[PDB]
Amino acid sequence: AGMFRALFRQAVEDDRYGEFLDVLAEASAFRPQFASPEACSERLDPVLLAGGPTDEGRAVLVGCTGTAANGGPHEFLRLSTSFQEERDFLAVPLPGYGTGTALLPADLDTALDAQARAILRAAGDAPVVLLGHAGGALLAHELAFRLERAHGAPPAGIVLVDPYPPGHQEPIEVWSRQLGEGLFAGELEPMSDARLLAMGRYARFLAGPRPGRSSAPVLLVRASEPLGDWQEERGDWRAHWDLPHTVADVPGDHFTMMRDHAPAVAEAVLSWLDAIE
Amino acid sequence: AGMFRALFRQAVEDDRYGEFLDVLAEASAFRPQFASPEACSERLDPVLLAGGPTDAEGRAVLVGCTGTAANGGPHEFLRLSTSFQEERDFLAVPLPGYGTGGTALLPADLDTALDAQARAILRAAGDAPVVLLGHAGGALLAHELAFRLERAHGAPPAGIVLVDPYPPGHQEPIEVWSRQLGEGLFAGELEPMSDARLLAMGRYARFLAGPRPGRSSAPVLLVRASEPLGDWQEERGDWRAHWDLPHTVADVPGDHFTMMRDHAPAVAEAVLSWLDAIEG
Ligand SMILES: CC[C@H]1OC(=O)[C@H](C)[C@@H](O)[C@@H](C)C[C@@H](C)C(=O)/C=C/[C@H]1C
Ligand SMILES: CC[C@H]1OC(=O)[C@H](C)[C@@H](O)[C@@H](C)C[C@@H](C)C(=O)/C=C/[C@H]1C
Ligand SMILES: [Mg+2]
């Protein structure tokens, strides 16, 4: 495949994921960009992956696609099956990953505004609950804040599946080799250099200073098994969010909670939606 | 074809050449390397591009030190070398990291690459004194090689010809003309610059910007372009190439690029006169 993918493979092999991610972020600055939501080069139409029962005003779930360069429309497929007959589940694309390759957002807010527009159109009058996993969880919260601040529309809730926010990401840094190996393992096709640059650009966005906190209630879903080695004395390795409305612990690790154990995540979401409604 | 080449093209358009070179250098860290001269994946056998008179011996041979340009290679000294035919042997030595046959390993550090060049040159030159010659980045490389030959190989060259060098204390013209320098790289493409070769160029650029000993005892011929490559506001000062304490300075027609492209005979003429002066 491409040179960036080859370099990434080597970086992961040499346990230098973080350093390589910084290269991707810097390199992404030289890709053509969109500087306003209207200038976004791709159709961000959310896809309906599960349907709820017939016979307002029940919340609709919106899956916020994560940053993984091997990811895309397949991210929520396993999870979404458990929502069939329970809740409408829409997956929204992350701008800059589409195909000629898509323009990268100039900044995170520009991407979030593009997403917000597409979601509000698709959702209509139904309340929206945003859901994301890992980096996608961080993106879900940032989107929630933007919706509230700039679109007069705070979501009804946010489901954060294994978030590792700034100040709480030591375990994810320590396990970066596993994260990189997971990306290669999860390839259905070679990760394009264009998507690797998108991934770096969003990683850098999510590491920067962000502008405040959503008023929406949060469900924190945590994996129960560590992805890699962790000394007990070094503290809790688990995902974190400040003062969530509800915490749910599920089987599996950072990865397998969304595969093998996706029904457990779905079960936690469904119960919580009933409680907040 | 390749994303690094696409990015480079955009960086040039946006007048961010320097910034992108830094990205190339950082990215190069993740290419497979050679850490000892012997582990070099390429045959650095110099090519004889011109022959001196059969009449030899004790007479200096010229060694062309290939520069860092990603669009470069064996074609670099073809025009210049014709002017040495029947005057001086001219050997062109490849720069490690640019070859194919699969792509070549990058040097771990500059000294490792210089040691690989040094071994190939000494083998090729035999008993003959060596005068190193390089243009632009290749000129900086010629000096670094000369010092290494002296310090690590007991073999200081008889001389060094630096064609239009811009050393670390005098980089402003290269900075001001960076867009023009990048555009020249795409103009000089015989084929699309490979991502592997762009990374090699970034790696060497970083090497050359870093702490370098260390000063060759060999006498220097500084050859300078007489025309500015791009626009230059007069009060910035002197745009011309520079070297500290050269043995002799020669000015030739053309700019940074055309001095070698259109006026290579004038470069050759300067070298031949100086070689006679330092030998006789
Ligand atoms: C050294 C590995 C990095 O972690 C990531 O790349 C995670 C997986 C990703 O979600 C990215 C999108 C998380 C963001 C916030 C980031 O910059 C992370 C930096 C390191 C913790
Ligand atoms: C923005 C232009 C750059 O200059 C080069 O890349 C020149 C052409 C090259 O010889 C390089 C190999 C010269 C070295 C010293 C370098 O790293 C230069 C960096 C910038 C001044
Ligand atoms: Mg001086």
Swiss-Prot record, chain A:
Changing D162A: Retains significant albeit reduced thioesterase activity. It comes from the Bacteria. The active site is at A134, H254. Changing E173N: Only relatively minor changes in the thioesterase activity. 10-fold reduction in the kcat/Km for ketoester. Substrate binds at T67, G135, D162. Residues 69-270 are annotated as: Thioesterase. Disulfide bonds: none annotated. Homodimer. Pikromycin PKS consists of a combination of multimodular (PikAI and PikAII) and monomodular (PikAIII and PikAIV) polypeptides each coding for a functional synthase subunit which participates in 1 (monomodular) or 2 (multimodular) of the six FAS-like elongation steps required for formation of the polyketide. Module 1, 2, 3, 4, 5, and 6 participating in biosynthesis steps 1, 2, 3, 4, 5, and 6, respectively. Involved in the biosynthesis of 12- and 14-membered ring macrolactone antibiotics such as methymycin and neomethymycin, and pikromycin and narbomycin, respectively. Component of the pikromycin PKS which catalyzes the biosynthesis of both precursors 10-deoxymethynolide (12-membered ring macrolactone) and narbonolide (14-membered ring macrolactone). Cells lacking the TE domain are unable to produce methymycin, neomethymycin, narbomycin and pikromycin. Type I modular polyketide synthases (PKSs) catalyze the step-wise condensation of simple carboxylic acid derivatives. Organizationally, type I PKSs are arranged into modules, wherein each module is comprised of a set of catalytic activities that is responsible for a single elongation of the polyketide chain and the appropriate reductive processing of the beta-keto functionality. A minimal elongation module contains an acyl transferase (AT) domain, an acyl-carrier protein (ACP) domain, and a ketosynthase (KS) domain. This is Pikromycin polyketide synthase component PikAIV. It comes from Streptomyces venezuelae. The gene is pikAIV. The chain holds residues 1057 to 1339 of 1346 of the full protein.
